[PDB]
């Protein structure tokens, strides 16, 4: 069944599950041609596959070459996503394969389902949550590795850095979705908040700054304030 606010804590139990977000798989810029018509130019994209319990991120980089000479690209993007997810599962040892895969957009259900036919005991589920994983390209190190890629490539990260040494999966995922929510609503302010203080650095092997516990409290409060402000501005409340 679908994932909503009710069955939220199921994400942090010991059944392996993966979120799949396809929003940044097919990315274009839109421009005018010499004759004045509109054209698109694709840029490199990525599939965002995340284990919410452990923070393991499987960032499958989608090179522009994959689109060459293909039609109905936005539709093709959904099937290439499902092909790549399926291959990822096949590549994992049996005890590491997920029992559920939760797609953030319902249009992925049929492609994934068809590509997972060989895994009848893996459940493909939609979600009613409005998750902010499209803002994954607002994380500088993820955007950088995608844009530099010259060939298809899988890059692994822990999207939680070392937070789980000190906090629970539940708290880690709430922090992650809050940071991305903010980055989505106002990338410039969000990034200002994260980087104002030059004395808090990002380890070479991390994505986010090495905030202390107390500093994370101030960050989370600043991100909250940002999101509510933007809401009043959007709706005049």
């Amino acid at each position: 069944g679908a994932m909503n606010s009710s069955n939220y804590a199921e994400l942090f139990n010991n059944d392996i599950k993966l979120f799949v977000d396809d929003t940044n798989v097919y990315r274009v810029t839109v421009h005018k041609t010499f004759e004045g018509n509109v054209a698109t130019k694709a840029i490199n994209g990525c599939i965002f596959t995340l284990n919410p319990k452990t923070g393991h991120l499987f960032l499958k980089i989608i090179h522009t070459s994959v689109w060459a000479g293909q039609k109905r690209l936005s539709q093709l993007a959904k099937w290439k996503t499902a092909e790549e997810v399926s291959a990822l599962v096949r590549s994992l040892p049996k005890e590491e394969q997920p029992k559920q895969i939760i797609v953030t957009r319902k249009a992925m259900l049929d492609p994934l389902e068809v590509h997972m036919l060989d895994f009848p005991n893996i459940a493909i589920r939609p979600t009613e949550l409005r998750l902010p994983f499209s803002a994954a390209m607002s994380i500088d190190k993820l955007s950088d590795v995608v844009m530099k890629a010259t060939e298809p490539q899988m890059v692994l990260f822990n999207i939680y850095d070392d937070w789980l040494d000190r906090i629970s999966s539940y708290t880690a995922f709430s922090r992650l979705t809050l940071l991305l929510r903010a980055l989505k609503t106002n990338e410039e302010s969000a990034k200002m908040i994260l980087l104002s203080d030059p004395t808090i650095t990002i380890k070479s092997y991390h994505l986010w700054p090495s905030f202390t516990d107390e500093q994370w409290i101030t960050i989370e409060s600043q991100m909250r304030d940002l999101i509510l402000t933007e809401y009043g501005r959007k709706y005049n409340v």
Binding site: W79, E83, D110, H115, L117, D118
Partner: protein
């Protein structure tokens, strides 16, 4: 012309023969239906005045034997039977006609309706879907479930229609996932037509049989099967031209014959809007599309 006599009519029942039907009163002297056109399958079906649930009936072909109806008071329903005594059967039939206690199969000579609903239906295939090989005729009712329905309980009472499932290994060749899901031509022509049905006439025969069972008995799983077999064709980019032209004729008469007040449960909105307006074959069903629009524009 052939005859199906009735021993008696002990309970008030609405009797149908093909697309025709008659109200018969409790212990009204009714003793059969005569002048039944040889050369097609037929169905005789029943709905008791006291139980407008459970419509039931028998598929038969008069060439295959001498058949008659008798009410069973233990099981509480009109049963079909075979009389093996040739002379004894002509004897009953002749006496009942002499006494004029039989209705005449009421065909209009201009009317090819029954022929067009049953063009490809053949008794030998019906008896494989309704397996009960000690009888030459086949019983069907409102409540019987299909083999596919059973997988998702008693298989002696099963409608063993051919299982069609668009999200199955059978339907989808490894490496052609997207291709085969968006364009079911493979599944239709190699798997189903060449593989399982052997030819289009058997495919059309099962499609028509499923429709008639949905129509005469409100058999829900038959309506699902009929729609599945339509969708498989309309969702295939590559279909023999003779199949498309015949499909349009088949569906035209099915839509023409359906009771107007039943279009809500018998017609799946999604399948019809997809076939007529979105599918590869959107343009290949001109007659079916004209009658759907002028008669059920609401469903669209």
């Amino acid at each position: 012309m052939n005859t199906v006599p009735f021993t008696s009519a002990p309970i008030e029942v609405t009797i149908g023969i093909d697309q025709y039907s008659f109200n018969v009163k409790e212990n009204q002297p009714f003793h059969g239906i005569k002048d039944i056109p040889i050369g097609h399958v037929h169905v005789i079906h029943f709905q008791h005045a006291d139980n407008s649930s459970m419509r039931y009936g028998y598929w038969f072909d008069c060439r295959m034997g001498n058949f008659y109806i008798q009410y069973d008071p233990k099981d509480g329903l009109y049963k079909m039977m075979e009389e093996r005594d040739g002379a004894k059967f002509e004897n009953i039939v002749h006496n009942f006609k002499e006494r004029q206690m039989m209705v005449s199969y009421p065909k209009i000579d201009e009317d090819d309706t029954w022929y067009n609903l049953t063009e490809f239906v053949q008794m030998d295939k019906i008896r494989k879907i309704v397996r009960k090989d000690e009888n030459q005729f086949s019983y069907v009712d409102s409540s019987m479930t299909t083999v596919q329905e059973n997988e998702l309980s008693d298989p002696a009472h099963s409608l063993n229609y051919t299982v069609i499932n668009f999200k199955s290994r059978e339907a989808i060749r490894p490496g052609h996932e997207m291709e085969d899901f968006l364009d079911k031509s493979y599944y239709l022509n190699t798997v189903m037509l060449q593989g399982i049905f052997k030819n289009s006439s058997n495919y059309f025969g099962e499609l028509q049989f499923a429709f008639l069972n949905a129509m005469f008995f409100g058999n829900y799983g038959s309506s699902l099967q009929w729609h599945a077999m339509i969708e498989l064709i309309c969702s295939s980019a590559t279909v023999p031209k003779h199949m498309l032209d015949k499909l349009d004729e088949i569906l035209y008469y099915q839509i023409k014959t359906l009771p107007e007040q039943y279009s809500d449960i018998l017609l799946n909105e999604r399948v019809w809007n997809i076939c007529l307006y979105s599918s590869f074959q959107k343009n290949s069903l001109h007659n079916t599309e004209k009658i759907m629009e002028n008669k059920y524009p609401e469903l669209l």
